């Protein structure tokens, strides 16, 4: 039968996506749609998986199309849980696409339905999504409405943190703490940003999540710069560098060096500034990062000019004019 082949194809789609082969898995889900099935419930789950797979492949236009089909079918068959899920997914896709007004409505529907159904897990997830949308909306612009969007994000993240604490969901706390800390940073609440990123750091360590650990050090560094605590900030960027190398991440290593360069400039230790800027210059060429190469040149020109070396300043400015043209 069609229904049996459809399920077989869908199972393989799910296997391949879980194994991290979204490209191959998409084709199986699309084969499954091609064969077809009378079970609209099954079809709905295939659309939703296509939507997510295309989302992770960064084809957001396609993700939206498939989540909208899923949302519609969820209404057709009166699957309220499925409707809630499809709405959250559509809202998240709209957020990435920069369509924040509609994203808010969809994410709000995921929440409202989750409450109606007394689904605490879904409710929590929807509050995180909403925090994210309001954060992106505020950041995309403070005018009062912008401050209000960011403050609503804070509130949504705090509400989430409250529920996921009851649920014992540590990975969810990790996500909320990190985005809450970034929202505090945008609002100028720099002490609160540190507190949030400290919790995020702790959770990253608990999971052995090296990239989350590295994000948190880096975000902590940024908050301490705006607190005027430049020495402490350099210390955190030292931790990110050490982690960058460990992880053998070339780009991330280059950022840390740049960040340290700027931080010593604020401390007025121009020799160290030069040192790290050179290391950034080096890795930027390697990765084919032309934009980075120019920035290094400009930074180095300013450091050599403040240090006293009026020859190398001119040389790097000379190199800055080249890159800028090229």
């Amino acid at each position: 039968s069609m229904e049996a082949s459809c399920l077989e194809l869908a199972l393989e789609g799910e296997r391949l996506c879980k194994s991290g082969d979204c490209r191959a898995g998409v084709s199986f889900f699309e084969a499954a749609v091609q064969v077809g099935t009378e079970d609209l419930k099954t079809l709905s789950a295939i659309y939703s998986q296509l939507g997510n797979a295309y989302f992770y492949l960064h084809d957001y236009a396609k993700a939206l199309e498939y989540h909208h089909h899923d949302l519609t079918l969820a209404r057709t068959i009166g699957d309220q849980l499925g409707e809630a899920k499809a709405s959250g997914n559509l809202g998240n896709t709209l957020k990435v696409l920069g369509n924040f007004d509609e994203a808010i409505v969809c994410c709000q529907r995921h929440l409202d339905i989750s409450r109606e159904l007394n689904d605490k897990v879904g409710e929590a997830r929807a509050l995180y999504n909403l925090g994210n949308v309001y954060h992106a909306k505020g950041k995309s612009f403070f005018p009062e409405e912008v401050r209000d969007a960011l403050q609503a994000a804070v509130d949504f993240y705090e509400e989430n943190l409250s529920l996921v604490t009851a649920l014992g969901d540590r990975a969810a706390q990790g996500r909320a703490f990190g985005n809450l800390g970034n929202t505090h940073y945008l609002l100028g609440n720099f002490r609160d940003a540190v507190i949030a990123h400290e919790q995020r750091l702790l959770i990253a360590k608990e999971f052995g999540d090296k990239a989350a650990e590295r994000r948190a050090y880096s975000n902590l560094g940024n908050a301490y710069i705006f607190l005027g605590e430049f020495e402490t900030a350099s210390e955190y960027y030292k931790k990110t560098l050490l982690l960058a190398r460990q992880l053998k991440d070339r780009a991330v290593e280059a950022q840390s060096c740049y960040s340290l360069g700027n931080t010593y400039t604020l401390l007025q230790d121009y020799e160290k500034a030069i040192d790290y800027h050179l290391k950034h210059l080096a890795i930027a060429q390697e990765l084919n990062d032309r934009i980075g190469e120019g920035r290094a040149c400009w930074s180095l020109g300013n450091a050599y000019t403040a240090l006293g070396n009026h020859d190398q300043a001119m040389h790097f400015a000379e190199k800055h004019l080249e890159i800028s043209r090229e």
Partner: peptide
Amino acid sequence: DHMEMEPETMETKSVTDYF
């Protein structure tokens, strides 16, 4: 200084939900 964000979650469905 760009703040680095945490990943989006997505909600997931499976054809096996109904086995």
